[PDB]
Design a binder for this molecule. Sequence first.
Ligand code: HEM
Length: 82
Amino acid sequence: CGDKKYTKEEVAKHNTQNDLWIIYDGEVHDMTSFYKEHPGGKVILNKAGQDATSVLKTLAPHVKAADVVMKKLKQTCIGKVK
Ligand code: HEM
C-alpha cells in the first residue's frame, strides 16, 4: 500500500467511473481502471469513495471469485486511511 495517508473525506471525492476509489480494510484502492471490467457492472459505484470491505468479503459473487477480488485489490492499493 505504501506510505500515502488519506482521510475518509478525501477518499469520498473519488466517486465516479473515471475517478473511482474504494476503502478495504483501512486501505485506499484506486479502482478507476477496473470499472469497465467489473463483472457486477456499474453497481461498483454504489460504494465509490466509500468503504466496501463487507461487500468485498461477503457478497456471494465476491466470495465465489475471492481469488480475482483479492488479486485486483493487491494491484490497486495507493495508501491507507488516517
Ligand atoms: C476488488 C474489486 C471489486 C470491487 C471494488 C467491487 C465492488 C462492488 C460493489 C461496490 C458492488 C455493489 C454492491 C451493492 O450495491 O450491494 C458490487 C457488485 C457485484 N460485483 Fe463486484 N467488485 C469487485 C470485484 C468483482 C469481481 C472480481 C467479480 C466477479 C465475480 C464481481 C462481481 C459482482 C457482482 C456479480 C455484483 C452484483 C451486481 C448486481 O447486483 O447486479 N465483483 N461489486
